[PDB]
Structure formats: C-alpha cells, structure tokens
Scaffold this active site. Structure first.
Site, PDB file in Angstrom:
ATOM      1  N   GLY A  15       0.768  -1.194  -0.036  1.00  0.00           N
ATOM      2  CA  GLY A  15      -0.064  -0.005  -0.064  1.00  0.00           C
ATOM      3  C   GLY A  15       0.823   1.237   0.029  1.00  0.00           C
ATOM      4  CG  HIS A  35       9.518  -1.487  -0.166  1.00  0.00           C
ATOM      5  ND1 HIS A  35       8.286  -1.019   0.568  1.00  0.00           N
ATOM      6  CD2 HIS A  35       9.663  -1.147  -1.261  1.00  0.00           C
ATOM      7  CE1 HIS A  35       7.819  -0.660  -0.310  1.00  0.00           C
ATOM      8  NE2 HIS A  35       8.423  -0.788  -1.648  1.00  0.00           N
TER       9      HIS A  35
END
Lengths: 238, 238
Positions: B15, B68
């Site tokens: 997301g 990430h």
C-alpha cells in the site's frame, strides 16, 4: 595510509571487474569461481547500498570497495576521512559503448542515446563519461584528503598486466610486499576464457550500427565537448 | 518530534505507493500526474541510494521517506537520532504474493519461491515478510528512540480512507492541523482509475496456480512459522 578504504572506481565496463578478479586471486591465492568469490576480496558499493548495507565509515583494516558513482555523490562524502587510496580506471569510451550493448534498431537507438549523453543514463550519480573521469581524476584529492590517487588506463593494464597490476597492488598498500610470481599467478587466474567461465558459471568502429552513427560518434569525439576533451587527454582521440 | 524524518515503511506492494499518492495530493494540493510528482512530497530511500544520494542525516524540516528495507539495516542506523515518526503498513501476504506477479509455469515457480521463503528474495535487506513486519512493528522504538510509531493495515486504510488517512496525516505531524475536506480531496485524487493512469502515464486464492500451490500456502499460513505467527496477528489467517 595503511588502514582505510581503497576505492576501485571507474565508469561501468572500464575494466573494474577484471581487476577485481585479479585482486581476488592475488589475495586469496585461488582463482575466483563465481562472483561471490570476488566479494571475499572487494565489495560493490552499489550492491551493499541496494541492501541497505554500506562499507565501514571507521575501518580497522584495509577495505577494497568498487563503485561507478561520481566521487561527489553524498554517500561517498561519508568516507572523506576514512579513505586511504583511490584507484581510478579509464577506458576508451567507444569500447565502453560497444561493451554496454551485449537487432540493429535497438542498438542504434542506444548508441544515439550514448552519444547524445556523452555516456550512460545508475543515471545521475553515475554522471556522463567525462563527468565521471573529471571528478575522480581531479577532485579526488579534495574529496578524500588522506588519500593517494592513482589513475590508469584499462588499455595499459591490458597491454602489460604483470607490470601494471604489480603497480596497482603496490599502490593499494595491502600490507605485504609485492611478490611478482604471485602477480603472474593472479594475471593468469583471470584470462579471457576464465573471465568467460565466470560469466557462464554465474548464470572496431560504430560502422555496423551505420556510418551515420559512426559519423555522430566521430563528431562527439573530436568536437568541443568535455567528452572530447578527456578522450583526447587519454589518447582515445586524435 | 516536529523536525526530522518520517519513514513510510512497508514490505513491497503493501500500500506504500497509494499512500504516497495521497500524501502528495494532500500536501501539494494537486493530484500527482507522474511519479516525479510524488517525489516532490516523499522520497524513495532505495532510489536515492541507487544514485549515491541519501536523505538528510540532520534535517531542518519534516522529511517523508519511503523504504522497504528492514529497520535494522546499517544505512537506517544513520537516522537513529534524526527520525521523528515511523509509519508502518501491513498487507495480507497472499495479496502481496499475487500482486508481485503482474504462463502458469512461470508463476507457480514464483509462488513456490515465495512460500518457501515466507516472502521475497531487495534480497536480504528486505527480509522475509514476517522478518520485515517484526522488525518494524517491534524494534522501531529501539532503532529510533525519538520516534513515535504507528502501524496500520493496508486493508483498514482501504476500508475507511478518509478516517484512516486523516489519522495518518495527523500522526505524521506535518505542522498544519488536519483539514478533513483536504483529506477527502486527497483520497479522491488517488482513485483506482487514477492509480491506473499513474502506471500508464508513467511508461482470491492461489488455486489458479494449482490446488497444490494453494495447499502449500495454506500450510505456511496456519503452520508454526513466524510467517504464520504474524499473519494470524493481523487477521490474515484463521
């Protein structure tokens, strides 16, 4: 210095890898069989960073790191004080161009891109060819004030590997005195075939592209551009 | 804090992007038309590092950075003191798996890989799914001792965007008090179609892969693994 970072810097495809093979073989004593082997002896900055890893900002030992980034990128800033040596490799830009492509339409476009950019587009921390050559060969002693700097042509390394590589090893100041027989062993460990196996085991003029393209390169090469300036300087142009 | 780094952290495809669109629209006032637009509002750590760039270690303003990477990678260490906020997004791992593939033979192998690795292989600074979830949701307050931390499910953001996004904006503490009508505008600016245009303008169960594969996932999902532990925790498993 003795402790600290040794940068093996160059534009992509400028001989960096071949040198890392020879350094791996000289130091470990055995010929690299894969790329992992080379990582034993020298690190890839881009690779480390890709993983959120980075070289030691305060190194207790000599550390060999490869990179293609411009010496002025913010990350290299971290190693201003810790850098002991800078080795910079230059290669004939034409040979870099050809090297990078390895379907005429596909290549030509690439070739065109290269010429229009005076190099490769990674991207902007890589800089154009002249950019990269200029920053490293001229600004290094500024960015790394504790470092000795040595610039060498790939072509020269290639023409007298034993002589040149011993110079490199000596320059790097790895702690032990250079033994020539080791040098020869290390050169032999990274023959063309050997380099070929490495690829495998781990997996001219621009006329063919068209005279129109050769033409465009020649214009760049002898023109008034920075590209043309540094080419001429390293004997790659007239 | 007020000045300092805001991390928008998550496993890939959790997301993160959609949020970066909403943050770009909320802040700039206009809907992002390309990715460059979003870069105006938030940076991509991996992208910066790719170029030898990096976020400010001593920031004079609030700074939004996506990543990430696992919170414990050496590079994030640089921002221990400078980090003010941590937002972590979680998504249903199954949805991440499917998402990542977008030729049965090709996919299955991928799916298999994922299940065998409890996530994606970039590579090791990314960690497996449970690894990434654990480190960020539990170790953040350790790695960033000046930071407030907020964890949210992608699914929850998706089910009540106006409510959740206003919570996010509020948490981030960007300096101005949250205006709900701006929130709604920002949510509307990043509709599915809009997200689709972004891709364009910038260029279930695992049964189809085979019941054998669905089966393998189900085993992972309800097994004794860390993967199974955190899945269950975020309501993704039984």
């Amino acid at each position: 210095s003795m402790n600290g970072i040794r940068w093996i810097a160059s534009y992509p495809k400028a001989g960096n890898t071949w040198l890392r093979c020879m350094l791996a073989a000289y130091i470990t004593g055995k010929a690299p069989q894969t790329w992992k082997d080379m990582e034993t002896v020298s690190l890839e900055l881009e690779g480390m960073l890709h993983l959120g890893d980075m070289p030691p900002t305060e190194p207790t030992k000599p550390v060999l790191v490869k990179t293609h980034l411009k010496a002025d990128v913010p990350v290299l800033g971290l190693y201003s004080e810790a850098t002991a040596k800078v080795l910079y490799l230059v290669r004939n830009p034409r040979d870099i161009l050809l090297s990078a492509m390895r379907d005429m339409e596909s290549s030509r476009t690439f070739a065109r891109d290269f010429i229009a950019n005076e190099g490769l587009r990674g991207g902007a921390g890589l800089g154009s060819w002249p950019e990269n050559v200029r920053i490293w060969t001229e600004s290094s002693r500024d960015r790394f004030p504790n470092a000795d700097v040595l610039t060498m042509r790939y072509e020269d390394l290639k023409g007298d590997p034993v002589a040149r590589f011993s110079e490199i090893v000596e320059f790097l100041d790895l702690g032990d005195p250079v033994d020539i027989e080791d040098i020869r062993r290390a050169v032999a460990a990274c023959t063309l075939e050997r380099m070929r196996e490495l690829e495998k085991r781990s997996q001219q003029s621009l006329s063919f592209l068209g005279e129109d393209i050769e033409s465009a390169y020649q214009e760049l090469l002898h023109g008034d551009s920075e590209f043309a300036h540094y080419a001429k300087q390293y004997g790659y142009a007239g």
